[PDB]
Nucleic acid binder design. Structure first.
Ligand SMILES: [Mg+2]
Ligand code: NA
Length: 1213
RNA sequence: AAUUUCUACUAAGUGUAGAUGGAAAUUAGGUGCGCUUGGC
DNA sequence: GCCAAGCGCACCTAATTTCCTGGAGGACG
DNA sequence: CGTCCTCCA
């Protein structure tokens, strides 16, 4: 036996199969003539409208409750929440006060008498109309009378808002778990940071943000939190923190701005506040002003031409500012000023090449006067900070003999004006009055590039100009320059709103129609599949051979398939006969205590008293003997209930054996499902479609083509298995199917075509058949060029699981008693997206390779796909698009594509080796800081892996075999959320990543030294703590003998005593890279300071140095020597791992000696080393399971400590 | 360069290989650019 | 040239809820 | 009463 096969039929899950629906015969014309698709497209728009009118009600309902709430538990919860020493029982009381706070919110909604009617037809029929005023809005709502069933799901989505549970879509959850937690964390930050705010700034927030009705401090007391339950108060509170922008553009500072300024001014690091999340269903309007944008291509072109032609004022303002600078000499250089700050940085760079040069020259002249250095540089920085402005004459001081500042400036303005003209010559045709654009602006990259290139050059000019404004408050200021310069600068600034607004419009995605749902004039269309509901749902399934069909009865002919009999002679369709008894624990009481049934069969008061009282259910009023007499009442009513009695061949148990009522309900549930097919005359059914009484679509994907001949999609197997006699409820067909129309979005004529009989280039370089020639055209994206029906079919897998155990526990047990358990270790990364190492129970490397490339072999042909390269390209295409205002392509499909191959390889690995999976326990705070690197695959990899392992099927297996489609493996727990995961998800273990990569696999050696240069005396103490430092002539290496117990915070190490050598090279990273030969660099350093490095033990000699640079360069070299991992950024060709320690045979581990070998015993590179040691850290956890009794396996801690890891790693060898 | 959809193909000629939980709702994040005030 | 706090706009990505129902019951001609 | 939409849990 294997460990996998114990994991079938563990839990239920639902999935959706999707198909094209192809109209058969006259159905399309009959659908055309009745205009069914037009009705459905309009209904979808109106449906979204009504959904908006309903929210306007729900929101008003929400805000009236929330505005009137005073939380009772509040002050007790805030008290206990801020306690810093909580006993376990206090933690429990905290959770109880959190629960009670949410129940307080849920009851304030649900205690309303009319609460229930907010989710039945009353809200559409009555409530929402009386609440509305617009005649047209009211008529829109009324148009769904008799159709409110179409809102059942939407009512569930709205119900969710009022749950008391800690669930993400709940108002209560948003208020208490999320916003109250931030509010309380902000109270602490207020008490720390309070003093930094002066009286003026607190008053400004009070006057402009608090309407002068509150003090800023009030929103940091516990009692004020009720103010913040509605979007209104959230807005005010986030404005205290972040400020706002006035109608005139002034940015009023919030508290976080003042904290940042203070930090930046004092070089401190005080914490900032967090803003509160939004109120559920709020219609948010910002408190900051932002001007009106543009709404059409024509408007944009008119604005662009009115405001930017040669004769426009903005152009003229440039021709003034040019002619002005071009005549600098008529104005006194002592009177034109560059404000100190960014303006001097800009001007420093344009004239001296670097931003800091003017500050540098200033510092040099300061030193000339004033010459401890910690205050000096700071006192001098302060004195330089006290300067507000710098004249042009003053700057000429800093010019050098050949340089003249004024002359250099006017070159720069000509350089930027010539750049502006340059772009105008390319913008000639765009200014023509006769110009009209063929392509829409949001699809016309050529026109937008002309517009953006022009706008950019004008912006570039504007930022240069702005540095010449100075502080402005200068007494010396030359108003014969300023006066006109300010008139022209103020009109130029008008290009700011234009630039923003043009980018805001031009970058919008163009409108794309969504598919829409088809109802066939039925508010419960295709609701389910039960025979006794065919007439209400008016949709069934048919089979003719291998082909399947959806059959829809017209609103006027619901019974037309009830009549049809076998055509004994000619051919016949098979019509499905589907019966389902869902949720017997609810349906059985409802059916057999109905007024319809209690007439026929009267209860005993015995029978009646139980269900009224409830002595049938396990709980506090439980009484076993009553369930038995009730199970039989039900069992005796099933006999007399014909539509159930003859639909399911029941075979119950001896009643005396049921332990509770649920033991009965489970047998009804499993047996309440049956699917068969009866004959129907194909002549009559066809004529029904002909006469328009029946609509017929073939349920299609490519595996049903007459030309299909390969392995079908897993989903095609699922679908056919729905109706296979060997499927005994492993996969049930579910209700809630849906049919949609997706209008074509490409024109056939506009499609890339490969014409018949002209050879097509094959793209796979390992494919020896270089060309393919077909006799028919082949079109790119062909499927989007015609309207398409799609059918979405829900299915349910393992609805009645028989293998109920805690999945994690079972894995630990199985690992304990497994003589040689294999591990697949997986290192997550971005140099290598994924890297795989498989080990055996003894830690031997069995397989190792990167997954940057997917190698697939089929039909003798090999194919390699460098997905790391493909994602890299996509990531760069998107960066460029963002900066260029061009189309931002998706990356997530490509990620999914890549990840699917990865997951397929991993599943094969799991099956081949019966192996469990080892991953880094990456906290979610690490995984978000790498989302900026859009190669990022960490979390999507996890989701798709965990999903597949919820029901893992070998498509090639026999469907009835273990691991086949009817008996999939479930070796991860049912995916509910990341929120709720532990460090073990069945076969997946998450272990501490610490020192899995930066460790010498052949010795266990790690770098536990702190080698940042801090001071001369610390460097002397560091050098002196080695047992010996000497040059080794016979090896041309420097040896550094250390005992780790002589060094700070090295306790984790186990071996303690090491001899380090200057062996090989290293890649130093700095801002770029350089290669360093360690021995040669040590010789350079010692020679630079006259050091006789041949004098045996040399550390006393080294401590005789007085130069700080020696000790600093020496610590740097030590760091490079202890830097075992070495790579070049964005590079395949360098990622080697090299150790400064010898192994027992006196050789240095160097991954590059193993990267060569096809079958390496040790890791081939640093990423392999990481995956390898992640796997071993799980091998250790398996060692812990072996140390423990089975009763206690659930409590074995799996996170190896850092000290246990170094001992483990250093005694493996 | 074809697809229920996606990725990679052409795979022997209207397709091949692997993956594929939909629908609705709510909410959050990341990138990029502009503006405000600031820090090397 | 780099970066911080905050406001805005455009885009794409993604976490976590819910349902995956037939038969009684009502409203209506 | 026969039909169609709503409601239950
Ligand atoms: Mg196939
Ligand atoms: Na942003």
């Amino acid at each position: 036996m294997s460990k996998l096969e114990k994991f079938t039929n563990c839990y239920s899950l639902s999935k959706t199969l999707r198909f094209k629906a192809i109209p058969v015969g006259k159905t399309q014309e009959n659908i055309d003539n009745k205009r069914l698709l037009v009705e459905d497209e309009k209904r979808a728009e109106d449906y979204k409208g009504v959904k908006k009118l309903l929210d306007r009600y729900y929101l008003s309902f929400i805000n009236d409750v929330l505005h009137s709430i005073k939380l009772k538990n509040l002050n007790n919860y805030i008290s206990l929440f801020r306690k810093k020493t909580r006993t376990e029982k206090e933690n429990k009381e905290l959770e109880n006060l959190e629960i009670n706070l949410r129940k307080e919110i849920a009851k304030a909604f649900k205690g309303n008498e009319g609460y229930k009617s907010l989710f039945k037809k009353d809200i559409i029929e009555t409530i929402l109309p009386e609440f509305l005023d617009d005649k047209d809005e009211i008529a829109l709502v009324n148009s769904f009378n008799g159709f409110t069933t179409a809102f059942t799901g939407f009512f569930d989505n709205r119900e969710n808002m009022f749950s008391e549970e800690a669930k993400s879509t709940s108002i209560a959850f948003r208020c208490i778990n999320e916003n109250l937690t931030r509010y309380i964390s902000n109270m602490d930050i207020f008490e720390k940071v309070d003093a930094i705010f002066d009286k003026h700034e607190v008053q400004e927030i009070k006057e402009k943000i608090l309407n002068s009705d509150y003090d800023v401090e009030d929103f940091f007391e516990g009692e004020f939190f009720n103010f913040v339950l509605t979007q209104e108060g959230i807005d005010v509170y986030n404005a205290i923190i972040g400020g706002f922008v006035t109608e005139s553009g002034e940015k009023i500072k919030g508290l976080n701005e003042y904290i940042n300024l203070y930090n930046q001014k004092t070089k401190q690091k005080l914490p900032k506040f967090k803003p509160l999340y939004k109120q559920v269903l709020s219609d948010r309007e910002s408190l900051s002003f932002y001007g009106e944008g543009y709404t059409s291509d024509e408007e944009v072109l008119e604005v662009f031409r009115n405001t930017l032609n040669k004769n426009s004022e903005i152009f003229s303002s440039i021709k003034k500012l040019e002619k002005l600078f071009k005549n600098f000499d008529e104005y006194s250089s002592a009177g034109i000023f560059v404000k100190n700050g960014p303006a001097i940085s800009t001007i420093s760079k344009d004239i001296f090449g670097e931003w800091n040069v003017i500050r540098d020259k200033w510092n040099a002249e300061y030193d000339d006067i004033h010459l401890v250095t910690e205050k000096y540089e700071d006192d001098r920085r302060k004195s330089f900070k006290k300067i507000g402005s710098f004249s042009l004459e003053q700057l000429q001081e800093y010019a050098d003999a050949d340089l003249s500042v004024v002359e250099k400036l006017k070159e720069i303005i000509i350089q930027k004006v010539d750049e502006i003209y340059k772009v105008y010559g390319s913008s000639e045709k765009l200014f023509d009055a006769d110009f009209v654009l063929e392509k829409s602006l949001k699809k016309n990259d050529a026109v937008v590039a002309i517009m953006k290139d022009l706008l950019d050059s004008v912006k570039s000019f504007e930022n240069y100009i702005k540095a010449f404004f100075g502080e402005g408050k200068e007494t010396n200021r030359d108003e014969s320059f300023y006066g006109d310069f300010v008139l022209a600068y103020d009109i130029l600034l008008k290009v700011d709103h234009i630039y923003d607004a043009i980018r805001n419009y031009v970058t919008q995605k163009p409108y794309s129609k969504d598919k829409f749902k088809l109802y066939f004039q039925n508010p419960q269309f295709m609701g389910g599949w039960d025979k006794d509901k065919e007439t209400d749902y008016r949709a069934t399934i048919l089979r003719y051979g291998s082909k399947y069909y959806l059959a829809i009865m017209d609103k006027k002919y619901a019974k037309c398939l009830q009549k049809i009999d076998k055509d004994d002679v000619n051919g016949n369709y098979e019509k499905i006969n589907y019966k389902l008894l869902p949720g017997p624990n609810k349906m059985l009481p409802k059916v057999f205590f109905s007024k319809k049934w209690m007439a026929y069969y009267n209860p005993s008061e015995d029978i009646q008293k139980i269900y009224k009282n409830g002595t049938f259910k396990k709980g506090d009023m439980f009484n076993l003997n009553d369930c038995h007499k009730l199970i039989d009442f039900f069992k005796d009513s099933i006999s007399r209930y014909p539509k159930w009695s003859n639909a399911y061949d029941f075979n119950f148990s001896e009643t005396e054996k049921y332990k509770d009522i649920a033991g009965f309900y489970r047998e009804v549930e499993e047996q309440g499902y049956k699917v068969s097919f009866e004959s129907a005359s194909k002549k009559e059914v066809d004529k029904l479609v002909e006469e328009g009484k029946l609509y017929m679509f073939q349920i299609y994907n490519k595996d049903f083509s007459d030309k299909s001949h390969g392995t079908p999609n897993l989903h095609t197997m699922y679908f056919k298995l729905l109706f296979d006699e060997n499927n005994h409820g492993q996969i049930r067909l579910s209700g809630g199917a849906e049919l949609f129309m997706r209008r074509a979005s490409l024109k056939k004529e506009e499609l890339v075509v490969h014409p018949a009989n002209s050879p097509i280039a094959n793209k796979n370089p390992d494919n020896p058949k270089k060309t393919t020639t077909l006799s028919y055209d082949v079109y790119k994206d062909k499927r989007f060029s015609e309207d398409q029906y799609e059918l979405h079919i829900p299915i349910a897998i393992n609805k009645c699981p028989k293998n109920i155990f805690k999945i994690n526990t079972e894995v630990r047990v199985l690992l304990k008693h497994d003589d040689n358990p294999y591990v697949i270790g997986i290192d997550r990364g971005e140099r290598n997206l994924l890297y795989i190492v498989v080990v055996d129970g003894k830690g031997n490397i069995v397989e190792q390779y990167s997954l940057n490339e997917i190698i697939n072999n089929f039909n003798g042909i090999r194919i390699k796909t460098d997905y790391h390269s493909l994602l890299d390209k996509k990531e760069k295409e998107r960066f460029e698009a963002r900066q260029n205002w061009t189309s931002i392509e998706n990356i997530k499909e490509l990620k999914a594509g890549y990840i699917s191959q990865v997951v397929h390889k991993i599943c094969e690995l799991v099956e081949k080796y019966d192996a469990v999976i080892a991953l880094e326990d990456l906290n979610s705070g690490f995984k978000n800081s790498r989302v900026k690197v859009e190669k990022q695959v960490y979390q999507k990899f996890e989701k798709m892996l965990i999903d597949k392992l919820n029901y893992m099927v070998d498509k090639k297996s026999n469907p009835c075999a273990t691991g086949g489609a009817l008996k999939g493996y479930q070796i991860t727990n049912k995916f509910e959320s990341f929120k709720s995961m532990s460090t073990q998800n069945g076969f997946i273990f998450y272990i501490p990543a610490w020192l899995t990569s930066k460790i010498d696999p052949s010795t266990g050696f790690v770098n536990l030294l702190k080698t940042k240069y801090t001071s001369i005396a610390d460097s002397k103490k560091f050098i002196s703590s080695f047992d010996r430092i000497m040059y080794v002539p016979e090896e041309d290496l420097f040896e550094f003998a250390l005992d780790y117990k002589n060094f700070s915070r090295t306790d984790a190490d186990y071996i303690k005593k090491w001899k380090l050598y200057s062996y090989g090279n290293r890649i130093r990273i700095f801002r770029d890279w350089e290669e360093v030969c360690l021995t040669s660099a040590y010789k350079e350093l010692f020679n630079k300071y006259g050091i006789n490095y041949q004098q045996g033990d040399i550390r006393a000699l080294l401590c005789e140095q007085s130069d700080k640079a020696f000790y600093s360069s020496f610590m740097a070299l030590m760091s490079l020597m202890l830097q075992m991992r070495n790579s070049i950024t964005g590079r395949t060709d360098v990622d080697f791992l090299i150790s400064p320690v010898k192994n027992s045979d006196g050789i240095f581990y160097d991954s590059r000696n193993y990267e060569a070998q096809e079958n390496a015993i040790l890791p081939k590179n640093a990423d392999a080393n990481g995956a390898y040691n992640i796997a071993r850290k799980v091998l250790w956890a398996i060692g812990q399971f072996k140390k423990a009794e089975d009763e206690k396996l659930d409590k074995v801690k799996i996170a190896i400590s850092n000290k246990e890891w170094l001992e483990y790693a250093q005694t493996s060898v």
